[PDB]
Amino acid sequence: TLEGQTPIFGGGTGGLLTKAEREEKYVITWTSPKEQVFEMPTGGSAIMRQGKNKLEIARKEYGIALGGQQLRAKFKINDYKIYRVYPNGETQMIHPADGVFPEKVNQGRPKVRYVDRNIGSNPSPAKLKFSGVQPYDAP
Amino acid sequence: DMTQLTGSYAASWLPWIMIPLIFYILPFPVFALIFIWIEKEA
Amino acid sequence: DMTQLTGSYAASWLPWIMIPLIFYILPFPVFALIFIWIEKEA
Amino acid sequence: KLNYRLDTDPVQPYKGDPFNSNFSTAITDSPLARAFINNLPAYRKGLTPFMRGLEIGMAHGYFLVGPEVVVGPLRETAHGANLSGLITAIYIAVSACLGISIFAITTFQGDPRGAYGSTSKDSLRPLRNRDEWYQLNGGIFLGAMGGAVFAYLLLENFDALDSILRGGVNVN
Amino acid sequence: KLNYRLDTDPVQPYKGDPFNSNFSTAITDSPLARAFINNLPAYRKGLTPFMRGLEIGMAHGYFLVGPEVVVGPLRETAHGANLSGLITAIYIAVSACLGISIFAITTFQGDPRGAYGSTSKDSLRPLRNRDEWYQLNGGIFLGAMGGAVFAYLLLENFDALDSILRGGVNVN
Amino acid sequence: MNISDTQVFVALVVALLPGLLAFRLATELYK
Amino acid sequence: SHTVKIYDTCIGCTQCVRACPTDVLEMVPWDGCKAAQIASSPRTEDCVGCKRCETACPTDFLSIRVYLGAETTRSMGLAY
Ligand code: F6C
Ligand code: F6C
Ligand code: CLA
Ligand code: CLA
Ligand code: CLA
Ligand SMILES: CCCCCCCCCCCCCCCC(=O)OC[C@H](COP(=O)(O)OC[C@@H](O)CO)OC(=O)CCCCCCCCCCCCCCC
Ligand SMILES: CC1=C(/C=C/C(C)=C/C=C/C(C)=C/C=C/C=C(C)/C=C/C=C(C)/C=C/C2=C(C)CCCC2(C)C)C(C)(C)CCC1
Ligand SMILES: CC1=C(/C=C/C(C)=C/C=C/C(C)=C/C=C/C=C(C)/C=C/C=C(C)/C=C/C2=C(C)CCCC2(C)C)C(C)(C)CCC1
Ligand SMILES: CC1=C(/C=C/C(C)=C/C=C/C(C)=C/C=C/C=C(C)/C=C/C=C(C)/C=C/C2=C(C)CCCC2(C)C)C(C)(C)CCC1
Ligand SMILES: CC1=C(/C=C/C(C)=C/C=C/C(C)=C/C=C/C=C(C)/C=C/C=C(C)/C=C/C2=C(C)CCCC2(C)C)C(C)(C)CCC1
Ligand SMILES: CC1=C(/C=C/C(C)=C/C=C/C(C)=C/C=C/C=C(C)/C=C/C=C(C)/C=C/C2=C(C)CCCC2(C)C)C(C)(C)CCC1
Ligand SMILES: CC1=C(/C=C/C(C)=C\C=C\C(C)=C\C=C\C=C(C)\C=C\C=C(C)\C=C\C2=C(C)CCCC2(C)C)C(C)(C)CCC1
Ligand code: SF4
Numbered sequence: 001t002l003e004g005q006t007p008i009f010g011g012g013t014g015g016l017l018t019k020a021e022r023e024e025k026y027v028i029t030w031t032s033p034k035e036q037v038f039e040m041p042t043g044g045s046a047i048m049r050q051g052k053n054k055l056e057i058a059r060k061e062y063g064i065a066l067g068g069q070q071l072r073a074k075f076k077i078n079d080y081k082i083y084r085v086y087p088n089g090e091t092q093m094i095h096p097a098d099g100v101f102p103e104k105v106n107q108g109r110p111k112v113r114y115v116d117r118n119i120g121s122n123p124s125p126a127k128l129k130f131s132g133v134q135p136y137d138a139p
Numbered sequence: 140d141m142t143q144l145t146g147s148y149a150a151s152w153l154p155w156i157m158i159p160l161i162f163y164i165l166p167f168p169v170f171a172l173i174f175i176w177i178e179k180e181a
Numbered sequence: 182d183m184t185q186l187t188g189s190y191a192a193s194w195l196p197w198i199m200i201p202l203i204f205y206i207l208p209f210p211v212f213a214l215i216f217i218w219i220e221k222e223a
Numbered sequence: 224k225l226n227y228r229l230d231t232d233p234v235q236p237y238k239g240d241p242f243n244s245n246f247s248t249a250i251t252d253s254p255l256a257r258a259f260i261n262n263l264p265a266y267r268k269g270l271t272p273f274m275r276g277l278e279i280g281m282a283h284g285y286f287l288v289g290p291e292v293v294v295g296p297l298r299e300t301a302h303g304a305n306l307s308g309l310i311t312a313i314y315i316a317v318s319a320c321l322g323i324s325i326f327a328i329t330t331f332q333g334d335p336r337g338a339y340g341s342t343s344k345d346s347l348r349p350l351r352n353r354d355e356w357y358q359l360n361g362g363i364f365l366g367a368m369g370g371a372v373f374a375y376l377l378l379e380n381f382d383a384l385d386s387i388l389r390g391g392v393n394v395n
Numbered sequence: 396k397l398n399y400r401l402d403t404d405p406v407q408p409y410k411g412d413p414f415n416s417n418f419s420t421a422i423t424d425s426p427l428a429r430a431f432i433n434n435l436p437a438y439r440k441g442l443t444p445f446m447r448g449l450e451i452g453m454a455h456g457y458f459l460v461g462p463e464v465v466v467g468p469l470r471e472t473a474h475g476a477n478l479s480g481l482i483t484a485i486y487i488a489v490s491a492c493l494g495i496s497i498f499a500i501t502t503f504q505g506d507p508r509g510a511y512g513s514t515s516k517d518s519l520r521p522l523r524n525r526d527e528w529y530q531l532n533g534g535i536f537l538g539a540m541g542g543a544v545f546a547y548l549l550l551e552n553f554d555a556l557d558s559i560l561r562g563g564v565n566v567n
Numbered sequence: 568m569n570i571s572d573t574q575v576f577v578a579l580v581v582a583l584l585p586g587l588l589a590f591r592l593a594t595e596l597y598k
Numbered sequence: 599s600h601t602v603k604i605y606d607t608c609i610g611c612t613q614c615v616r617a618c619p620t621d622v623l624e625m626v627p628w629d630g631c632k633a634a635q636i637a638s639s640p641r642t643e644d645c646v647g648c649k650r651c652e653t654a655c656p657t658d659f660l661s662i663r664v665y666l667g668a669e670t671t672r673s674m675g676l677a678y
């Protein structure tokens with residue numbers, strides 16, 4: 001379970017919808033040094049509490065925008081985490097994936113979807129006809 | 140003519156529609172509403 | 182007379198029924214068939 | 224120094240959840256609005272799906288006859304206008320029932336998508352089973368056909384009913 | 396030296412069972428035949444028994460009016476011919492619904508005999524419960540009565556419909 | 568003197584043959 | 599989901615990772631550039647295709663490329 005107190009908010013029209021209860025939902029948790037006003041990702045203003053906060057958001061981009069552009073940039077809060085919550089109740093922490101923010105290089109991270117050539121050396125699509133491989137996926 | 144109910148006043152169709160509505164159309168639904176009200180479990 | 186749709190051609194009753202059939206009788210069932218076809222789960 | 228003043232707010236979050244995209248207003252949460260909406264045949268507690276459809280069909284089929292009788296293209300004659308209004312109600316209701324049928328066919332495959340899935344909590348869409356939709360549709364069609372005919376019969380006998388409501392039937 | 400050549404046979408055993416008294420033919424197992432038959436209201440997947448009866452009755456009551464209107468003993472006058480056709484459809488449908496009722500009464504005692512027993516696997520007779528047969532019967536009667544009356548109304552107003560479908564109602 | 572009722576009915580029946588063959592081709596192409 | 603590929607011309611300026619609004623990208627150790635780091639796309643399932651990363655990329659031509667593919671709920675940016 002995710003712990004924290006929801007920010008003071010009188011209600012809004014940009015909150016969760018059927019997708020939250022049916023497919024997936026996101027939660028962003030952070031700790032603030034004081035009670036202050038922040039902008040909700042989908043409009044309106046909310047008041048983050050003194051201790052640790054928990055906010056439910058419909059999309060992952062809401063958490064990245066709130067944590068990155070407001071918490072880090074404006075409030076100097078660097079401990080925010082984003083969780084993906086499924087209807088069955090399972091919760092996985094997706095940001096930061098390994099506890100280190102992606103913009104900082106961290107050991108043990110593998111190279112994913114790396115092409116060992118310059119982009120101008122991709123093969124022509126005529127060579128890959130009926131093979132099902134895209135030019136950028138070609139070896 | 141005096142073989143039917145009529146009205147020389149304005150909108151004489153208003154009694155024509157409202158007498159049935161108040162006296163033998165709506166009263167049974169109103170009684171149903173009151174009966175549901177007075178039978179509700181606590 | 183020119184107050185109604187008529188036909189001097191053979192079997193002039195055919196447009197009398199075929200126009201309603203193709204244009205406002207069958208199309209909704211046809212759309213229903215296509216809707217079922219394009220929404221079927223894999 | 225920050226005072227949201229939520230405790231004295233005339234408009235509260237809906238059902239105490241500030242993040243459900245809804246407000247507690249007079250339309251959505253007042254005692255009269257809740258009593259009226261929740262006791263309509265679509266939401267009335269305990270009603271069987273067929274009984275829900277029957278009452279909805281009766282109400283809708285009855286008034287759908289009217290528009291073509293008064294301003295329709297057969298309005299010049301009483302007999303023709305009534306027939307056109309009855310057919311218009313039948314065509315609309317049958318088309319709607321066909322839509323309700325194919326809605327049930329396509330929605331309820333495996334775990335339904337959206338608001339009709341198993342984990343959905345949409346209180347405004349309580350018919351969560353395929354069987355309930357088909358029972359509702361049967362009630363909708365029969366109610367709409369009956370209500371349309373009831374309006375058709377009253378309009379067809381409007382001359383007699385007008386004498387009825389004025390006491391002209393008491394001459395002899 | 397024996398070559399049954401079953402692998403290249405255009406007509407195969409039905410459903411892979413050579414000993415079920417059936418063949419895989421264009422009528423029994425072609426994709427179009429299966430799609431049409433299995434989607435008739437008697438077999439359509441997910442339909443409630445009442446909704447099956449409503450569609451079956453609607454179609455049958457509608458066309459049963461016709462035969463007595465055209466070649467019946469009251470065909471000399473339009474008004475009489477329509478009434479005789481409506482009554483004939485009502486009498487036939489009520490007789491059929493009475494037969495359906497007594498079918499359900501006698502078939503479903505204990506473990507039903509024949510194709511409606513618990514261990515029977517008759518894919519062409521899927522209504523295995525007494526409740527399903529009564530729900531079907533209610534839909535059959537109401538659908539047949541509604542379809543017969545719908546045909547009766549169109550035939551009774553045939554002069555109006557004929558002007559309707561020719562634009563003769565647009566003179567005034 | 569345009570065609571008669573029988574000719575119209577015959578054409579309707581004849582058109583069934585390309586109608587069924589069009590369905591056969593359409594379903595075969597769908598495979 | 600969209601496909602995000604990183605080519606060997608990357609200089610490890612971390613600008614694509616900072617520009618991503620859904621955290622698709624991260625910086626991983628590398629040796630092909632002076633910065634000793636290269637961009638990676640482990641979370642392309644969260645990629646919306648905004649191409650903010652390509653705008654941020656300073657190399658010529660782009661060291662990071664986004665190829666729009668099959669659309670999902672999260673790639674369409676749908677809150678419903
Ligand atoms: C466009 C538009 C349009 C149009 C056009 O213009 C129309 C028309 C029309 C016409 C035809 C008629 C009249 C005629 C006269 O005047 O004369 C007769 C009368 C009488 C006969 C009357 C008598 C009396 C009665 C019988 C009583 C009633 C009863 C009830 C139903 C019960 C109730 C129950 C519960 C309580 C509810 C009518 C009517 C109508 N309505 Mg119409 N509409 C429209 C609309 C609408 C809407 C929206 C809505 C809502 C939903 C609506 C409703 C309604 C109702 C309820 C109604 C009635 O009742 C009536 C009848 O049907 O009837 C029979 N619309 N419409
Ligand atoms: C002995 C034999 C015999 C006879 C005698 O001879 C008869 C007769 C007769 C006569 C009466 C009439 C015409 C008429 C005239 O011409 O004119 C009017 C028209 C109109 C009005 C028309 C109008 C238009 C409409 C309304 C439309 C349609 C609708 C639909 C129903 C819907 C559909 C839906 C889905 C898609 C299916 C009739 C009709 C008939 N049908 Mg008889 N029939 C017989 C048989 C049969 C069988 C088997 C079968 C298959 C079951 C059958 C079917 C049918 C159908 C569907 C029908 C249609 O509709 C019609 C009516 O009803 O109507 C109203 N039969 N049809
Ligand atoms: C208390 C006042 C009062 C009383 C006793 C009556 C009495 C009557 N009115 Mg009436 N009327 C009134 C005020 C009143 N009117 C007002 C203010 C209006 C204008 C909106 C009308 C408009 C009106 C029309 C259009 C018609 C009547 C008609 C009638 C007669 C049949 C009843 C009916 O159809 O009601 C119809 C009533 C209304 C359309 C609205 C009534 C509004 C009043 C203010 C409601 C009063 C509620 C009451 C005080 C609370 C009772 C509490 C309880 C404990 C007793 C009856 C003689 C009918 C008639 O003439 O038949 C021959 C008729 O067609 N009335
Ligand atoms: C492609 C050829 C073609 C076209 C465009 C039309 C067009 C028309 N016909 Mg027609 N007709 C055709 C061939 C065609 N006809 C043939 C071959 C026959 C003999 C069976 C008829 C028999 C016929 C009758 C009896 C009547 C019409 C009528 C009409 C009119 C209203 C539409 C209707 O009710 O269709 C009715 C159509 C049929 C009964 C059968 C049509 C059979 C054709 C071959 C189907 C062609 C399908 C097409 C090629 C596939 C489209 C693919 C798609 C991607 C576009 C309209 C002007 C009506 C009229 O005159 O109104 C005033 C009418 O009552 N047609
Ligand atoms: C010959 C077979 C046949 C017949 C007579 C009917 C008759 C009927 N169906 Mg139906 N239906 C059929 C096959 C048939 N169906 C099949 C195969 C399916 C599976 C897709 C359906 C699915 C279906 C649904 C989902 C619903 C109906 C409904 C209805 C009734 C209202 C009309 C309507 O909405 O049509 C809709 C018809 C279709 C969607 C498909 C019809 C396909 C057949 C082959 C049409 C044959 C017409 C033929 C070419 C021309 C004859 C008519 C003409 C001479 C006037 C009506 C009694 C409705 C009902 O019960 O009302 C309350 C309704 O909601 N039907
Ligand atoms: C007056 C005309 C009214 C409109 C035309 C009729 C519309 C519906 C007709 C087809 C319904 C059933 C579909 C096949 C029955 C069926 O279940 O087929 C099954 C067939 C194959 O499906 P799959 O490959 O997924 O395999 C599923 C298996 O069950 C069958 O192999 O898929 C189709 O839907 C067929 C191709 C699409 C449709 C092709 C075009 C439609 C016909 C075009 C030509 C019309 C000629 C008209 C002549 C009169
Ligand atoms: C009214 C009512 C209601 C509701 C209902 C519903 C929900 C309905 C639905 C309906 C529906 C759900 C419908 C549908 C429709 C459909 C359509 C309209 C379709 C169309 C299609 C088309 C047009 C196609 C096209 C195409 C394709 C896609 C492919 C191939 C080509 C073509 C062109 C063929 C309720 C219950 C509340 C109550 C009572 C009343
Ligand atoms: C919200 C509200 C309102 C409104 C209301 C409304 C909208 C109403 C409507 C109403 C209606 C719109 C109604 C209707 C009803 C109906 C009915 C009552 C029907 C009946 C029917 C019948 C009875 C039928 C029968 C049949 C059958 C079934 C079969 C055979 C044939 C016959 C015909 C017999 C108001 C503004 C006032 C006020 C405020 C609030
Ligand atoms: C149509 C229909 C159907 C159904 C059907 C059924 C299932 C039916 C049944 C029916 C039945 C189930 C019937 C029954 C009948 C019976 C009878 C007809 C009887 C008779 C009897 C007699 C004649 C008697 C005799 C005797 C004896 C035995 C002893 C003593 C002496 C004497 C002589 C009295 C279905 C569902 C498919 C679909 C829809 C339509
Ligand atoms: C297989 C096939 C076919 C055949 C088809 C058929 C056989 C058809 C029939 C059809 C029919 C035979 C149809 C019918 C239908 C019906 C209907 C659509 C009805 C409706 C009804 C109604 C709507 C009613 C209503 C009502 C009620 C319910 C109550 C009150 C009164 C009234 C009247 C309102 C052909 C050869 C072509 C081609 C090939 C394939
Ligand atoms: C006269 C008469 C009759 C009747 C008949 C009828 C009723 C007919 C009908 C007819 C019809 C009604 C026909 C139709 C046809 C159609 C067609 C011919 C179509 C075609 C199409 C096409 C060729 C195309 C196709 C395609 C493809 C291939 C693929 C994709 C899709 C589509 C569709 C585009 C009877 C025998 C009873 C009796 C004797 C007399
Ligand atoms: C109360 C309510 C509501 C509201 C509403 C409103 C505010 C409005 C509506 C409106 C509407 C919803 C309307 C409708 C309309 C319709 C129409 C306008 C139709 C028409 C039709 C016709 C005209 C037809 C014709 C025909 C015939 C008859 C036969 C064959 C041929 C033809 C096709 C020609 C809602 C939904 C929210 C919810 C529920 C309840
Ligand atoms: S396209 Fe947008 S979401 Fe996808 S990796 Fe680039 S910046 Fe991130």
Ligand code: SF4
Pocket residue numbers: 604607608609610611612613614615636637651654655656657661662
């Ligand atoms: S913006 Fe371009 S150069 Fe900079 S780290 Fe990303 S891919 Fe490499």
Ligand SMILES: [Ca+2]
Pocket residue numbers: 392393394395
């Ligand atoms: Ca009297």
Ligand SMILES: [Ca+2]
Pocket residue numbers: 296297298299564565566567
């Ligand atoms: Ca007119």
